[PDB]
Amino acid sequence: ADREKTRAVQELSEQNQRLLDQLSRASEVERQLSMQVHALKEDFREKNSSTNQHIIRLESLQAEIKMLSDRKRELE
Amino acid sequence: ADREKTRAVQELSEQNQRLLDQLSRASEVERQLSMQVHALKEDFREKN
Amino acid sequence: SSTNQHIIRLESLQAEIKMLSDRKRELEHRLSATLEENDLLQGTVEELQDRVLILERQGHDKDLQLHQSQLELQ
Amino acid sequence: SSTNQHIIRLESLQAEIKMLSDRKRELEHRLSATLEENDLLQGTVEELQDRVLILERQGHDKDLQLHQSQLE
């Protein structure tokens, strides 16, 4: 009974430790995916800032074009 | 000794079940994050 | 003597595991709340970025028409 | 035998404790990172709102200028 109990608890602890490495790898994948998602959020925010700046620059250039169109029509 | 065997077996089994639940939750959030990463990469390609 | 101590450390570690698991649920709920308010702040900054775009659009069309108005004045 | 079963049960207890404590450190690491990010996000919100306020000030300023320029 000693040997059976010891083998059983050792087997169950081995299943446990295998699960522990599985959780460790799963949590490392969770962490790497979380850092990826986090950097993607930060880059999405910076890119949305840059895109709003870009369309506002397109827009400023559009008013400069309309400005010069009405100005040349004034001269013309 | 038999009672102690039963108690240790039950405690280890409970720990293993808790760990299995934790791996289930971990895998669920991992799948959610993988879906989020692929959606973000598609959105980032479109935004590019 | 070892075995008496040995039983004592079983009891101590069992109490430790119970409190430790309780604070596992604690920390995981804190992380869930932190992540939800992170997503709320994501919605907030996204709305603020859209508002920045919209007000700059307003000020721009406003710039178009200011220059038009004072040119027509000229 | 008693000591071996008992110390193996304790090795199970402590190994579970070490997994869970590694996971404490992982959750605390993630909580620290996320809270630092949330500070950064509050800073971004404050800066965006301040930008919105400055933009609204420009708002009222030219709106007055429109009112005059239409008058003359």
Q: Which chains touch A (3 or more CB pairs under 8 A)?
A: B, C, D
- Resolution of the experimental model, in Å, one decimal: 4.4
Q: Flag if D34 and C30 touch (Cβ within 8 Å).
A: no
User: How big is chain C, counted in residues?
Assistant: 74
Q: For residues A38 and C47, what is the distance between their CA atoms, to the nearest angstrom?
A: 19
3-state secondary structure of C1: coil
- For chain B, the first-to-last Cα distance in angstroms comes to 68
Angle, vertex CA D4, rays to CA D2 and CA D9, nearest 5: 95
Closest of C30, B47, A50, B30 to residue D38, by C-alpha: C30
3-state secondary structure of B1: coil
Q: Flag if D26 and A45 touch (Cβ within 8 Å).
A: no
In the numeric block, the tokens 């995916």 are attached to: A33
Residues of B numbered 13-42 whose beta carbons fall under 8 angstroms of chain D's beta carbons: which are they?
15, 19
Q: For residues D39 and A38, what is the distance between their CA atoms, to the nearest angstrom?
A: 14
Return the structure tokens found at C17: 């595991």
Q: For residues B47 and A56, what is the distance between their CA atoms, to the nearest angstrom?
A: 16
Task: Identify residues of A whose CB sits under 8 angstroms from chain B CBs.
Answer: 1-2, 5, 8-9, 12-13, 15-16, 19-20, 22-23, 26-27, 29-30, 33-34, 36-37, 40-41, 43-44, 47-48, 51
Query: Taking a C-beta distance cutoff of 8 angstroms, is the pair A9, B12 a contact?
Result: yes
Q: For residues D23 and D18, what is the distance between their CA atoms, to the nearest angstrom?
A: 8
Q: Flag if D66 and C63 touch (Cβ within 8 Å).
A: no
Q: Flag if A63 and C57 touch (Cβ within 8 Å).
A: no
Distant-in-sequence, close-in-space partners of B34: CB < 8 Å, separation ≥ 6: A33
Technique used to solve these coordinates = cryo-EM
Cα dist. C71→A62, B15, C64, C67 in Å? 17, 80, 11, 6
Distant-in-sequence, close-in-space partners of C4: CB < 8 Å, separation ≥ 6: none
Q: Is A27 exposed, middle or buried (0-12, 13-18, 19+ CB in 10 A)?
A: buried
Closest of C37, D1, C42, B34 to residue A4, by C-alpha: D1
Closest Cα in chain A, distance from residue D30 (Å): 8
CA C17 to chain centre: 30
Q: What is the 3-state secondary structure (H, E, C) of chain A?
A: CHHHHHHHHHHHHHHHHHHHHHHHHHHHHHHHHHHHHHHHHHHHHHHHHHHHHHHHHHHHHHHHHHHHHHHHHHHC
Query: Taking a C-beta distance cutoff of 8 angstroms, is the pair A37, B33 a contact?
Result: yes
